[PDB]
Every structure is written in structure tokens, then in C-alpha cells.
Design a protein around this nucleic acid. Structure first.
Ligand code: CL
Ligand code: CL
Ligand code: CL
Ligand code: CL
Ligand code: CL
Ligand code: K
Ligand code: MG
Ligand code: MG
Ligand code: MG
Ligand code: MG
Ligand code: MG
Ligand code: MG
Ligand code: MG
Ligand code: MG
Ligand code: MG
Ligand code: MG
Ligand code: MG
Ligand code: MG
Ligand code: MG
Ligand code: MG
Ligand code: MG
Ligand code: MG
Ligand code: MG
Ligand code: MG
Ligand code: MG
Ligand code: MG
Ligand code: MG
Ligand code: MG
Ligand code: MG
Ligand code: MG
Ligand code: NA
Ligand code: NA
Ligand code: NA
Ligand code: NA
Ligand code: NA
Ligand code: NA
Ligand code: NA
Ligand code: NA
Ligand code: NA
Ligand code: NA
Ligand code: NA
Ligand code: NA
Ligand code: NA
Ligand code: NA
Ligand code: NA
Ligand code: NA
Ligand code: NA
Ligand code: NA
Ligand code: NA
Ligand code: NA
Ligand code: NA
Ligand code: NA
Ligand code: SR
Ligand code: SR
Ligand code: SR
Ligand code: SR
Ligand code: SR
Ligand code: SR
Ligand code: SR
Ligand code: SR
Ligand code: SR
Ligand code: SR
Ligand code: SR
Ligand code: SR
Ligand code: SR
Ligand code: SR
Ligand code: SR
Ligand code: SR
Ligand code: SR
Ligand code: SR
Ligand code: SR
Ligand code: SR
Ligand code: SR
Ligand code: SR
Ligand code: SR
Ligand code: SR
Ligand code: SR
Ligand code: SR
Ligand code: SR
Lengths: 186, 154, 95, 92, 160
RNA sequence: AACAGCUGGUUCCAAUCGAAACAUGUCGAAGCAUGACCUCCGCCGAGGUAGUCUGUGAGGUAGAGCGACCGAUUGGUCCUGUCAAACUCCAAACUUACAGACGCUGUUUGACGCGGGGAUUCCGGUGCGCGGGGUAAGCCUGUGUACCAGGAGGGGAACAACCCAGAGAUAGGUUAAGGUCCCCAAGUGUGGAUUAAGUGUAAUCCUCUGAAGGUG
RNA sequence: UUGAGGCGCCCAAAAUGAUCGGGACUCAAAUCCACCACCGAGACCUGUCCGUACCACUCAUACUGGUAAUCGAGUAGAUUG
RNA sequence: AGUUUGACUGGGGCGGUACGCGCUCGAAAAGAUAUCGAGCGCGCCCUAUGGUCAUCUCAGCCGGGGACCCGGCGAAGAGUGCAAGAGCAAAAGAUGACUUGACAGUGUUCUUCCCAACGAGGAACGCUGACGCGAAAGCGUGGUCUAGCGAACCAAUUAGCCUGCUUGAUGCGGGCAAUUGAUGACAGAAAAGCUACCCUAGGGAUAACAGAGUCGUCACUCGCAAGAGCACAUAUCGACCGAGUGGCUUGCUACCUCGAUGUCGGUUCCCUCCAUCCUGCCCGUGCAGAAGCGGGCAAGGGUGAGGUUGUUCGCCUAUU
RNA sequence: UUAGGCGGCCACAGCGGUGGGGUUGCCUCCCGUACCCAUCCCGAACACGGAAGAUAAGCCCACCAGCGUUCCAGGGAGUACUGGAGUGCGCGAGCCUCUGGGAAAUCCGGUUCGCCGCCACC
């Protein structure tokens, strides 16, 4: 920018979307990456592999296409995250993918976070992924219990639209139960 | 196709330059060879440019020299039309000369020594200390120029 | 030379042009080569580890197996055969 | 330089990490009954005594560390390469 | 010391003051003479002294020639005549002398010189058509004090 | 019959190949050892690479430039004056790794390579190109190359390394460098111009000087 | 009046006897631009022979025939008759 | 009494260490490359100034209330132990926390030593074991990279085992693996000088003297002509700077001679050079004359005697 | 790709500027602290929960060249420099010719306000 000698960062570094130092350490495993990403409203999980002209996504799952199996709840929470991971995980198994390493991008490794929920989901789908159980939220929270008990302090329905008043972690069970099922159109 | 004639001896010439002449089958002063005009050969002659005389000869001249100085791969045997006819893919010297000039074959392929051992230039040459443009005999020559030299070294 | 260390006279060859300064892209540090492949050797100023002796910059060897994540590349120093341990970060496929 | 009197490190005997105690190697006393001792007596006579007429060399500006690392559980010590150090004080 | 000792360019460029100490000061008093508040474009005539051979000119010579030239312009046009002259080269090359025989001979620092390539302008003066023959005379005296033969060339000027 | 790393000497013919005057270590620099390099023998069995072209790479010297770093370096009320072995926004020629192609070479002349026997050698020198030191040197110390050393014969008045030229014997011929007025083989050659100083009749050079400046 | 080029002149002093090798040379026997014909090596071409290497035949390294444009200098030194 | 008292070196000595290491340049854009080459460093320091993880972004400038607080600009000029060059910004830097991988064993490869053999040392990259941190990939075989280093014999030290002469017990020994202790002349001897009383082997491989090359020094000249010379550059004197000639001084170099080319000064006797002191012939003058000053041609002839000092040189005297 | 995720090349992509775009869609800003988690102090950030509002930021789409950068034509320049050769020139430092290569500054006019890969998606 200033002159001939000026040094402009790599594009994805300017955009502040790719931590290249973390990326290298990640790519060293030689395994595919389980890309866990978040949006204010959605959660995405991708199984990316290295390629000659750029990465290759062999399977993915977006919280949006979660409804395609019977999801009538919001898509920016724990139950949403876990399920999206499981879906992507299952699709991954179908593609022949057997193992991966969790890539959480610029998100923080906070215990019980959603990226770890995504990870737990993928692991349950049958994917072998280096993890640490006690960094994963305890079952109930993944189910969405923390949200139900929150709506208990009602007086005003947590959810605007009507999915339900006291919400349902039971819906979480139905959807998971539905995915672990062999049939299911992936 | 160019005609190469070494006009300057080996003493004091760079070794990589001397080795080049040897790869072009010339091992003595006044020895001539016929070389196709390729990028590969072009570099070689450019490297030897200062110890040689070269250029494209006329059909006739090549014929005179072939008759007078060509030799079998082995032996004394004169290389005349009959020889050419009973040993080569051609009917006479002219057919051979033409094919060489048109770069369709080589003296070797036809069972001939790759080298034409010429005689010193009758009447002397223009000197080996200057190029053609300066009045000398070194470097690239005119077709008429090469012809004069080759004919003189008949 | 006034000294005989490994980096003597390596000012130029081990320095980045200002614009190529800074951490290098990971892609080439993870590249995979097969035994028999011809590879050019050139140290990447920005990459500290996995280097070979500077004297060998410019060589084009032959991958002949590996040691850990680094590669074992065969070359000929003058007339002598040598095996060089080097990571992909400092290698490039020939052609 | 400073150095901890105790710390966790590999015990080549237990074959697992444990708390070791670091001590400077105290010189053991000679007996005067080693082969070299008898050779000195045997070979020293009238005139020069060859090697036995030589005297103690000099000193390097700095000496290397000379320590014993003792496993706090099995009690057995082991030795390590030393490193040049002008001074060495243990912390505690 | 004779110039024969330093006039040729037979040594590496030696100018790095970060590695050379005790360099004698320059004897050149001025590089811009005459009316330095005026421009060169404000004059019809521009004459330059051109060096015909590549050489090194010690600061002692620059000053002597610059002096004998400007000193003439002063005498003929006045201490404020309407003209301006410039010595465009500066003595960057540091000079040594080995003043023990050839043992540890690297010389001690003794001076500075300017490297001038053949065909370059050492001096360039600007004057009016009237004082054209005076500047030519100043240069004649100037080239009698520097090693090489020179050409007095009239650049901007055709009133002949 | 002391020992010496020091001086001197070491006796017949011929045929093939043919160096090193350098690197590492050394109480080592007038010496050795280990390598480089020379040579001899056995083994292996199909490629090899002194030249060039092209492709895929390596490089910051020449040059250049610095409102591109850096540090030097002018003046005026942006402009205006300069530089760099230990500066670089630039950047050759060129050198170099690997591969293919052409060339050359090898498969009875066995290359490339491997193993073993025997060395000599580790005072070098010169020309040219590039250097660094030095006022310089027929100086000192590098580097690449060809030569002398260890290279005849022709030329250069003579003359290790400048020019031609690398050479079995003998014989005929034609040239090379160089030369053609005589000495001295070949022209008192041709067309044209300049010079009046015997300038000059002197490639290169310790060797052949001739400068700044000046010349109706 | 002024610019450019060619050759020459001044600048130019050393020790036994001056020199371009010498003689000597001036529309040259000098210098520059061209050009013509010649002389001149052991180089190059060519006849015969010798050595060495290789090939064919052979017990032969004895003869005989063949190949060498791509063999023929050499100090120290290695190898062989 | 026996010996030692090193090497390098524009001869040797004195000085210095280019005697072991690292960096830039020299170095001629691959690699390699010398000099008593230019600039300059290392013989340690650090339990954190090592390791990991989390959080974070530095110099410097500006604006608001050279300490602190807020905002903006800001690819890197900060910082990173110490030379130099290089590396590094969601870090290799800073802060905080945790931790001891500065771990044991054993290798591959490169380097040391380009090519091309050679040890100690060093580095990169592995494996086995045991660990630290991290969610995990992963990172940690000390400090971002290149200096910070040492053989055999002997001793001490660490853990287990082998072994000592017919045999058993005890003592005390011998050994396998490794750590520490130094040789800096740093691929390791335990080590001062004089010789003119000297001696030998050799060297012109190397100095004194003469020659030779060079010419900085020395001698002489030329160009330009500031200046002064009451005015006047050029009667005369003549700075600066610039260009040369000589080979008389001095210095440099190490070509020639060390199985020998006799030293300084003087003397005697011969030849020569000219940059001329006199003599001849001239030009200028700040040339009235006389006596001078300066310059030109010119080497035929002349240029002498004495006092001090070995002196050359030089000082001094009377003649000329 | 009517706004997305992961990238490769790593300024042709930077700096700066103009215009346009979003009812249950996407990205955001945004709203909000019971929880997982968090600030050496702050739900600012990190983390979690969520849609009342908005297209003003970001982002995506279209475009501008003043600065920086890449490439191209002409000029500078076959200049500077240079590998091979020369009984060519110069007192000399050095230069020239033939042969094979061949810049840099700078001027001028164009180019460049990213290109490409995988996945997902009215
Ligand atoms: Cl995200
Ligand atoms: Cl290596
Ligand atoms: Cl200790
Ligand atoms: Cl020969
Ligand atoms: Cl005469
Ligand atoms: K002598
Ligand atoms: Mg034949
Ligand atoms: Mg003839
Ligand atoms: Mg001729
Ligand atoms: Mg360099
Ligand atoms: Mg014999
Ligand atoms: Mg014989
Ligand atoms: Mg330069
Ligand atoms: Mg000899
Ligand atoms: Mg005659
Ligand atoms: Mg004459
Ligand atoms: Mg004795
Ligand atoms: Mg000595
Ligand atoms: Mg190099
Ligand atoms: Mg000892
Ligand atoms: Mg001990
Ligand atoms: Mg030593
Ligand atoms: Mg050594
Ligand atoms: Mg004696
Ligand atoms: Mg001598
Ligand atoms: Mg005598
Ligand atoms: Mg006279
Ligand atoms: Mg006389
Ligand atoms: Mg808008
Ligand atoms: Mg000459
Ligand atoms: Na980089
Ligand atoms: Na005894
Ligand atoms: Na001295
Ligand atoms: Na002896
Ligand atoms: Na030698
Ligand atoms: Na030696
Ligand atoms: Na000796
Ligand atoms: Na081939
Ligand atoms: Na040059
Ligand atoms: Na020879
Ligand atoms: Na002769
Ligand atoms: Na004459
Ligand atoms: Na011999
Ligand atoms: Na000693
Ligand atoms: Na080693
Ligand atoms: Na002398
Ligand atoms: Na002189
Ligand atoms: Na005498
Ligand atoms: Na006289
Ligand atoms: Na006297
Ligand atoms: Na605090
Ligand atoms: Na917007
Ligand atoms: Sr005894
Ligand atoms: Sr005794
Ligand atoms: Sr000591
Ligand atoms: Sr020089
Ligand atoms: Sr002059
Ligand atoms: Sr080079
Ligand atoms: Sr005539
Ligand atoms: Sr004529
Ligand atoms: Sr001589
Ligand atoms: Sr000359
Ligand atoms: Sr002149
Ligand atoms: Sr012979
Ligand atoms: Sr022979
Ligand atoms: Sr031979
Ligand atoms: Sr003694
Ligand atoms: Sr001396
Ligand atoms: Sr490190
Ligand atoms: Sr016993
Ligand atoms: Sr004393
Ligand atoms: Sr005495
Ligand atoms: Sr005279
Ligand atoms: Sr007189
Ligand atoms: Sr004397
Ligand atoms: Sr005296
Ligand atoms: Sr908020
Ligand atoms: Sr001169
Ligand atoms: Sr071209």
C-alpha cells in the first residue's frame, strides 16, 4: 500500500477469517478437518480435505437443512449444534470418511461450547476424532435442558413464534433418534 | 546446411571450444564437415565462430569437394558417381549433394566419413586474425565466399 | 572466508525479498512427494526448521524415502553422493 | 546461575518421572592401593621418573557442571552431561 | 603528493563513512557561486567544462580550479556580476597512503577525491551573451589545474 | 658403517600411459601422513556426458538507482547539486543443479563404476580476463583459463611461456604466422591520398615512452 | 567569422660508439583506404616404410590380410619387451 | 650433569597472533577461494532469560484529560541476553498462568573437511522409554539461526554386571558403559637465556653490500599565473594546483651471487654527461656609465691551495 | 454464491473514493444475561439465549486510477554492462571492431479497483 517494500498480509489474513498458524498445525495430522463454524442464527459442519487448488469438502451439514428431518425449533443453540454435527458426521461416514481433527477456526475453546457440541455430534456419527470428554457440555445441556429451565422463569414465552411455551428437549431426542436410524435419506 | 572448416589450430584454444570441434568431427586444421542448421548445431558453430570458416555452399561446389575429398567410413576408395551409386541411396554425387544440402541425410548414414579433409587454400586465404567483415577469413561466409574458399581448398 | 560456519556468505540466499517477508503459506509445508520424484532444494527464509546446509541451495535431488515428516533426498555434490534430510517447506516439484 | 534443589525429571532406574534431588559431586578419597599407585612406587628411582616427574596441569576458565541426580523414591542416583557454568547455586 | 598517485580509478569505491574514520575535511569552499538566488533558466548562455578522460580529482584540485575560475569571473564581472557557476561533483572517494615495509600496508586516510567519467560536466556556468567570452576564459584557467584535457562546451547559446 | 627432514652422486636399449607444484592434519611450513592427481592389475556389464539447444530450478557481480531502505553528500525562496566493498525499488552477460533432445562416446578398443598394488607431488612460473593490497615494481596475495615447467618446428634481430604450430621415418606438393628494395626466399606491384619531421620504417613488452599545455 | 577531422611540429636533458636487426629509404622502402600477384613450417594434402592399438585367420604374442579423420611430443613417476 | 627454550612473519628480532572459533565485505550473482586484507566479535550469561498454553500487539507521531487513562494513524522502524548478517506480528515479541523436553536410551543424515580421505565438537531429522502443556491437531531432543570448545593415560563420581593363577572365606585389586577434572601452541611435549670464543650442515629457498625493477622520497623541468615588485603578473621574485624528465639521495621489492663479484673515505690514472661555475657569442633589464641581476647557444679548455673532522657532506681562511 | 463456509495463488488482490442491495430466506449490525463460559474492572470482548428493529457499519453487487502494485506497446536503447576472438587504436589509465547476449532510471500511452478451486444455497 505505502510502497514497493510494503508487505500486505495474505488475503484470508486481511479478512481475518483464517488463522494460518493454527491451520498448519491442523494440517500436520494428515487427517481431514471437521470445520465447525457458527452464525448468529445457524451452525455449519464441514469435512474438508486438502487439495491442489484449494480445500475439498467431502461432506457437510447446515443447521438449516436440519428441518428436512423434522426440526421445528430455532437453529442457533446447543441441541441444534450437536445434531448438525451428527448429520455431517453421518454424511461423512457415507462418503468413506473415517477420521478427522476438529478445526474451530477463530472460535474460542470454551468448555461446553457449541463447536465442541458439533464435535461430539460427529463422534457419535461414528467418526474417530481426537477429543477430551470433560471439555464437552454435559448431556442435558446438549439436549437443550438449560433452555427449558430458562423458559420456566416464564411470564413471557422465551420463543416469539410458537414452537411451544416451555420448549422441548424431547424434540431433540426425536430428531437424534431419527438420524441414528439406518433408513434416513441423507 | 553449413560447411565447417577449421582454420586455426588447437594450441591455446579453450578446451570447451576444442571439444566442440571434436564433437563436430573435426580434429585437424583444414578439416571440413557438413552441419544441419538446427538450434543445437547453431550454438556449437557460434562457440567455434573464431577458429573456423563456415557458410552454406552451392550445389556445384559441394559436388566438387565431395568428389575430390569425400571418403568411405574406412579405406582409400574414391567417392565417385559409381561409388555413390553402388553404396548410397543416391544415383550419383549430385543426388547426394542435394540431399545433404536439403538436410535429408548425412555423410555417415551413407557410409562416408563425416569429415572432408581439404588441401591448403591455393593462393592462400584472407588471414586468421580477422573476421570476414574486416577482410579476414574467420566466421560466417557468403555462399560465394564459402565457395571461393572450399574451391581453393579443392 | 574469515569464518567457516554454516551461514558464512549466506546473506543473500537466506534473505527474503521484502514482499515475500512474513510467515509462509502452509500448503507447501505439507506437500507430499513420492520416492523417485525430482525435487528442487531451496530454503525458505521464513521457515526456521527442516533446513539443509545452505551450500546445497539450487540442487535438484531425488526423493528416496523419508524420516519422520522430513524427506530424505539424494543428490550429487560435485562427484560425491549425499543424502539430505529436508522438510517440504524447502522443496518444490520439478517441472 | 541458579538451579532448583529438587524437581521432577526422568529416573533411568524407576523408568518413570519422579522428584530428584540435585547434589554437587563431592570428591571421594583415594586409597593409594590402585595399580597406578604401585607403578609410581615401582618405577620411581634414581634420576627423572618419566611420567611420575610431571606436575598438575592448569585450569580452564570455567568448569562444567558436576552433579548427581537422586531419585526421591528409589534413592538411586544417575549422572548427566554437565554444562559450563561460572557459578552454580541451588534454590533451597 | 603528486596526483599521479591518485588520478586513476584503480581501486574499489571507498566511501562508507560508517567504516572509515579520520577523513580530512574538504578544501572546496563553495559549490554554488555567483548569484545563487537566481535560476539557471534566467540566462541565455550556458557553458560547461567537460572532462575528456575518466579520472579522480582530489579536493585540493577542485578548490584550486574552482578558485582560479570563479576568481576570474569576479575580476571581470564584479563581486556580484550577473552570472552563476556550479561545481556539480563532490569528493566522495576516500584516499589512502601507506606512510614496516609492505607488511600491514593498508594505508592511513589522507584525503578525498571525486570520480569523474569522461564526457561529464565538472563545471557549468550561466551568463549573458556579453560575458560569454569571460566564462570561457575562467574555464581555460580551470582546466589547467585538473589532471585531464577538457572541452569548453556551449550548451544553451547560439549568438555566434 | 653415530644421526641429519640438509648438499652432492646413483652406471645398458626400446615400447604404452603420463603428473603434482593443490586440500586436511602435523613442534608443521628445506619434512611427513591423508586426500586430489598419475600408473598398473582384478571385478562389474550398459550406459556415459567435455559441447549446444530447450524445459524445470538456484544466484544479487557488472550496470543502474535511491519521493525503495540505509548512510553519506549541495544550495535557494516544492525546487536544485552529488555518492556507496561492508546500501538495494531494480538488474544483466554469466556461472550452476536436474531432465529431454542433437552431437560425441561405450557394449571383441568394456565405457560409467567398484576393489586392490605402485607412485611421483604438496618452492612453481608466465600470458589473458576478473580481481584485493601497494605511489609503484621484472611487487605481494587470490581467482578462471591457456601455456612454460615437461613442448619440437616456423616467425618475432637475439629471447621459457607473444604469433603460427602440437611432432614417427623418408619423399613430393600447398599453405600458416610472418614477409616480398638489398643483406634474404618473394613486388623497387596497382589505383588513390597524406606526411617533410628521417615524423616513421617499433603488434604484444621490465624491453616499443612520451604528458599537461600549445601550433596562421 | 566559427565548428570538425587527418598527418606533422613545439613541449623533449645523461653519462665508452648514433641507430628502425643493419644498409639505407621521401609521388617511399613512411602512413591511411582499397586491390593484384607471390615467397614462406615438421601444419595441411599425397607415395612408400616403422611402431603402437584394434579386427580376421591362427597354438602363436609366428605369418598373411584389414582398420586408425576420430594413433604417434613429454620431466617426476607407473607398466612392459 | 642431561636437556628444553615452538610455529606464523614481504629475511630475522622487537611489535603483533591473521595459532581454536562466529558474522559482513573482500569473493568476480551456484560451490570453493589468499595476504601482518577492511569492519568486529566468541572462550559466557540465564531455573528463566528454558518449555507449553491462554490472552494480546510493538516502535514512533497526533488529538482529549516525557508518569497513568481514552481514541486515531501505524507490516514492523519495537522487542527478541551479547558481534554481524539473517528470521519473526491472531508471533519466534508482550503479559499472565502452569511446567521442568536444559529428560534417559539409540540412531539416520549433514557439517567439521565444497569437490575428496580425517577426530573431538556441532546441527537437522528419526525411533524407544518417560513426561509437561493444550480441547485437539500439535509443540517441547534448551535460549529464533550461525561463536561459547578439548584425545589417550590417570583420578573421582553413577548403576548393574564380568573377573584376580589348585580351592573356600575375607580384604584389596583388574574390566564393560558413562559423567566430571586440561592441554587457548586450542587434532594435546613436562621446558629459560648468552655466545664478538665459537663450530657444522645448507640457502641467494632469506638479510647486509653492489647490480636490477620501481620512483613515494630526492634532483631538475614544464603548464596555469594568485600575488608583490611605489604604478605595473611576466626586469626580478613567485603560492596553489596540474603535467613530466632523470636515476645522484632515500625508501620499497627479493630477480641475480652465500662450493665468496673484498668495505667507507682518501689517493693515483683514464674516458664520459650537461641540468654551464669561469671563459666565447648573444637577448632582456627596475640596461646612463661602472658593477650587477635574469635568460639563450655552447662541454674546447679550465674549475686550484689550505685549518678542524676517518669522514662523504659540511664549516671556515686567503687567493682566483 | 439476492448477501454463505473452507481455501489456493498471496497487492493484478494494497490505499483512497462513488453508487446499489435485503417481511417469515442468508450474513450481519442488533436485543438480552437463567444457564456452559467470561472480564487481574467492565455480557466491551469471549460464551450462551434470542428476533423488536435496521440495511447506517461490515458483507455482497456495480464502478472510479489520484497513490502503491502487475503486465504490455512505443521512446530512452541495441545505449550501460557483457561470454568468445583480434599482429585493431592509445604514452598510458583505457578504447575499438567482429561474434553471441543485453539492462536500469525515466517519459508516454494502455492494463490492474483480483483470479481460480471445493461445498452448500431460489
Ligand atoms: Cl465461525
Ligand atoms: Cl544438509
Ligand atoms: Cl557443579
Ligand atoms: Cl600434444
Ligand atoms: Cl636517416
Ligand atoms: K653471497
Ligand atoms: Mg579412413
Ligand atoms: Mg605460394
Ligand atoms: Mg597473413
Ligand atoms: Mg554478496
Ligand atoms: Mg629406456
Ligand atoms: Mg619397442
Ligand atoms: Mg557499481
Ligand atoms: Mg621441472
Ligand atoms: Mg631475392
Ligand atoms: Mg625516430
Ligand atoms: Mg643425548
Ligand atoms: Mg622462523
Ligand atoms: Mg559464491
Ligand atoms: Mg598426559
Ligand atoms: Mg570428578
Ligand atoms: Mg594444532
Ligand atoms: Mg583445524
Ligand atoms: Mg659455517
Ligand atoms: Mg632470490
Ligand atoms: Mg674480483
Ligand atoms: Mg644546454
Ligand atoms: Mg670534452
Ligand atoms: Mg448503504
Ligand atoms: Mg601499444
Ligand atoms: Na515468507
Ligand atoms: Na620393577
Ligand atoms: Na614490523
Ligand atoms: Na641428526
Ligand atoms: Na606449493
Ligand atoms: Na606443511
Ligand atoms: Na624440515
Ligand atoms: Na545421449
Ligand atoms: Na565493469
Ligand atoms: Na604443454
Ligand atoms: Na627466432
Ligand atoms: Na629515423
Ligand atoms: Na618418462
Ligand atoms: Na617447544
Ligand atoms: Na561428529
Ligand atoms: Na633504488
Ligand atoms: Na621518473
Ligand atoms: Na675508496
Ligand atoms: Na666546456
Ligand atoms: Na676540509
Ligand atoms: Na496486579
Ligand atoms: Na449494509
Ligand atoms: Sr624398580
Ligand atoms: Sr627420582
Ligand atoms: Sr587457564
Ligand atoms: Sr589497484
Ligand atoms: Sr589538463
Ligand atoms: Sr562466480
Ligand atoms: Sr614500389
Ligand atoms: Sr601509391
Ligand atoms: Sr632489461
Ligand atoms: Sr607502449
Ligand atoms: Sr599534447
Ligand atoms: Sr613417439
Ligand atoms: Sr610418446
Ligand atoms: Sr599424448
Ligand atoms: Sr642451551
Ligand atoms: Sr628488514
Ligand atoms: Sr531452536
Ligand atoms: Sr590365592
Ligand atoms: Sr633476561
Ligand atoms: Sr669483546
Ligand atoms: Sr645540450
Ligand atoms: Sr659567460
Ligand atoms: Sr658515499
Ligand atoms: Sr657534518
Ligand atoms: Sr450487548
Ligand atoms: Sr604518462
Ligand atoms: Sr536479442
Amino acid at each position: 500500500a505505502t510502497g514497493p517494500r510494503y508487505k500486505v498480509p495474505m488475503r484470508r489474513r486481511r479478512e481475518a477469517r483464517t488463522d494460518y498458524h493454527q491451520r498448519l498445525r491442523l494440517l500436520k495430522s494428515g487427517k481431514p478437518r471437521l470445520v465447525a463454524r457458527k452464525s448468529n442464527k445457524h451452525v455449519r459442519a464441514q469435512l474438508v480435505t486438502l487439495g491442489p487448488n484449494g480445500d475439498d469438502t467431502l461432506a457437510s451439514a447446515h443447521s438449516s437443512d436440519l428441518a428436512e428431518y423434522g426440526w421445528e425449533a430455532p437453529t442457533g443453540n446447543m441441541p441444534s449444534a450437536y445434531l448438525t454435527g451428527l448429520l455431517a458426521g453421518l454424511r461423512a461416514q457415507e462418503a468413506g470418511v473415517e477420521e478427522a481433527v476438529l478445526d474451530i477456526g477463530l472460535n474460542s475453546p470454551t468448555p461446553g461450547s457449541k463447536v465442541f457440541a458439533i464435535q461430539e455430534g460427529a463422534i457419535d456419527a461414528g467418526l474417530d476424532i481426537p477429543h477430551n470428554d470433560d471439555v464437552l457440555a454435559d448431556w442435558q445441556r446438549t439436549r437443550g435442558a438449560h433452555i427449558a429451565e430458562y423458559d420456566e422463569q416464564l411470564e413471557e414465552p422465551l420463543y416469539s413464534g410458537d414452537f411451544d411455551a416451555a420448549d422441548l428437549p424431547e424434540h431433540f431426542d426425536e430428531l437424534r433418534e431419527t438420524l441414528l436410524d439406518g433408513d434416513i435419506e441423507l | 546446411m553449413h560447411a565447417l572448416v577449421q582454420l586455426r589450430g588447437e594450441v591455446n584454444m579453450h578446451t570447451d571450444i576444442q571439444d566442440t570441434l571434436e564433437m563436430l568431427n573435426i580434429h585437424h586444421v583444414n578439416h571440413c564437415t557438413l552441419v544441419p542448421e538446427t538450434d543445437a548445431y547453431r550454438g556449437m558453430v557460434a562457440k567455434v565462430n573464431d577458429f573456423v570458416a563456415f557458410g552454406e555452399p552451392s550445389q556445384e561446389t559441394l559436388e566438387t569437394v565431395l568428389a575430390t575429398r569425400a571418403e568411405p567410413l574406412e579405406g582409400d576408395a574414391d567417392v565417385d558417381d559409381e561409388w555413390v551409386a553402388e553404396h548410397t541411396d543416391y544415383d550419383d554425387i549430385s543426388g547426394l549433394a542435394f540431399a545433404l544440402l536439403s538436410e535429408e541425410t548425412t555423410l555417415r548414414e551413407q557410409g562416408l566419413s563425416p569429415t572432408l579433409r581439404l588441401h591448403p587454400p591455393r593462393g592462400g586465404h584472407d588471414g586468421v586474425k580477422h573476421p570476414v567483415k574486416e577482410g579476414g577469413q574467420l566466421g560466417k561466409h557468403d555462399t560465394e565466399g564459402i565457395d571461393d574458399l572450399l574451391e581453393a581448398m579443392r | 572466508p574469515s569464518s567457516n560456519g554454516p551461514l558464512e556468505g549466506t546473506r543473500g540466499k537466506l534473505k527474503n525479498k521484502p514482499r515475500d517477508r512474513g510467515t509462509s503459506p502452509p500448503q507447501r509445508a505439507v506437500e507430499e512427494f513420492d520416492d523417485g520424484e525430482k525435487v528442487h532444494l531451496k530454503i525458505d527464509p521464513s521457515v526456521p526448521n527442516g533446513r539443509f546446509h545452505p551450500r546445497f541451495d539450487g540442487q535438484t535431488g531425488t526423493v528416496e524415502g523419508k524420516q519422520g515428516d522430513a524427506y530424505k533426498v539424494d543428490i550429487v555434490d560435485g562427484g560425491k553422493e549425499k543424502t539430505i534430510i529436508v522438510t517440504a517447506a524447502h522443496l518444490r516439484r520439478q517441472e | 546461575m541458579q538451579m532448583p534443589r529438587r524437581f521432577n525429571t526422568y529416573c533411568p532406574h524407576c523408568n518413570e518421572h519422579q522428584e530428584h534431588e540435585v547434589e554437587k559431586v563431592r570428591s571421594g578419597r583415594q586409597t593409594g592401593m590402585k595399580w597406578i599407585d604401585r607403578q609410581r612406587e615401582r618405577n620411581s628411582g634414581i634420576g627423572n621418573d618419566g611420567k611420575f616427574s610431571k606436575v598438575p596441569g592448569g585450569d580452564k576458565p570455567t568448569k562444567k557442571t558436576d552433579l548427581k541426580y537422586r531419585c526421591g523414591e528409589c534413592g538411586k542416583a544417575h549422572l548427566r552431561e554437565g554444562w559450563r557454568a561460572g557459578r552454580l547455586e541451588f534454590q533451597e | 603528493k603528486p596526483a599521479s598517485m591518485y588520478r586513476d580509478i584503480d581501486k574499489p569505491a571507498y566511501t562508507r563513512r560508517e567504516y572509515i574514520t579520520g577523513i580530512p575535511g574538504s578544501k572546496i569552499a563553495q559549490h554554488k557561486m555567483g548569484r545563487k538566488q537566481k535560476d539557471a533558466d534566467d540566462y541565455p548562455v550556458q557553458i560547461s567544462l567537460i572532462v575528456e578522460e575518466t579520472v579522480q580529482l582530489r579536493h585540493g584540485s577542485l578548490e584550486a580550479s574552482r578558485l582560479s575560475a570563479n576568481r576570474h569571473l569576479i575580476k571581470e564581472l564584479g563581486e556580484e556580476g550577473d552570472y552563476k557557476m556550479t561545481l556539480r561533483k563532490f569528493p566522495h572517494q576516500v584516499l589512502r597512503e601507506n606512510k614496516d615495509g609492505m607488511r600491514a600496508a593498508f594505508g592511513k586516510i589522507v584525503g578525498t577525491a571525486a570520480r569523474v567519467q569522461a564526457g561529464e560536466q565538472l563545471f557549468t556556468a550561466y551568463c549573458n551573451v556579453e560575458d560569454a567570452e569571460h566564462v570561457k576564459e575562467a574555464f581555460r584557467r580551470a582546466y589547467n589545474k585538473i589532471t585531464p584535457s577538457c572541452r569548453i562546451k556551449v550548451e544553451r547559446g547560439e549568438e555566434l
